[PDB]
Amino acid sequence: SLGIFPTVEKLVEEMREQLDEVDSHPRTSIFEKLPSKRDYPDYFKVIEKPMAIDIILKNCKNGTYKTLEEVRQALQTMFENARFYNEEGSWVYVDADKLNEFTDEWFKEHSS
């Protein structure tokens, strides 16, 4: 069984369609995979629970996340990690906040 994967895959596609107004980069870009431990080894010593979109999708396929509540918390952690690690107003920080506002609206509709 695919569990909640079909619904979360739809959410992820909607997130990927949120593009920056100036350069059109998808706001999901920097969140698709974890930072490279080779490039940013210290990220893994300051961020207690790393999270990325690939992990959320794999967790939905393998049954680790069976509820939208679990996905909500995984996204919350992902965005909190980005707001902690990156400078306020940087492209990564703004992408986190804009995506978080979008996902909050989506969860509201799926909890209505």
Binding site: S29, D42, Y85, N86, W91
Partner: peptide
């Protein structure tokens, strides 16, 4: 805001140590 040209992260300076 536009992506950093190399695509890098934007760590707070203290976290670059």
């Amino acid at each position: 805001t536009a992506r950093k040209s190399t695509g890098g992260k934007a760590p707070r300076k203290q976290l670059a140590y």
